[PDB]
C-alpha cells in the first residue's frame with residue numbers, strides 16, 4: 729500500500745465501488761434526487777429509517793457534520809447503502825436490476841474489504 733492512512737484505504741475501496749455497474753444509484757442521496765418522484769421518496773422515508781450514499785460517506789471520511797471514527801463504522805455505512813436498496817426494491821419483475829446492482833456491489837465490497845489491510849492500519853495507529 730505505502731499509504732499508512734486507514735481512511736485513504738477506505739476512500740480507495742469506495743472509489744473502486746464507483747466503477748461498478750449502475751454505481752450512479754448509490755452516489756448521491758435518494759431523498760435529494762430530482763430523478764425520483766415525491767410519491768416514491770415519501771414511501772422511502774417510511775421503509776428506510778437511515779439513508780446513506782457514497783458522497784455522504786466520502787465527506788464523513790474527510791472530516792478526520794459527523795465523522796467516521798473507525799473502519800468498523802465505515803463497513804457499516806457502506807453495507808447500509810446496499811441493504812437499504814435490497815429492502816426497498818424487489819428482487820423480481822422488470823425493475824429487479826436495482827436490487828441486483830446493490831447485491832453485486834456488496835459482493836464486490838466484501839471481496840475488496842476481506843483482502844484489505846485497513847484494520848491492520850487502524851490497529852497500528
Ligand SMILES: CCOC(=O)Nc1cc(-c2ccc(C)c(NS(C)(=O)=O)c2)nn2c(C)nnc12
Pocket residue numbers: 752753754755756757758761762763764768812813816817823826
Ligand atoms: C422503481 C421504484 O424504485 C426506484 O426507483 N428505486 C431506486 C432508484 C434509485 C435511483 C434512480 C435514479 C437515479 C438517477 C439515482 N441516482 S441518484 C440517487 O444519485 O440521483 C438513483 N436509487 N435507488 C436506491 C439507492 N434505492 N432504491 C432506488
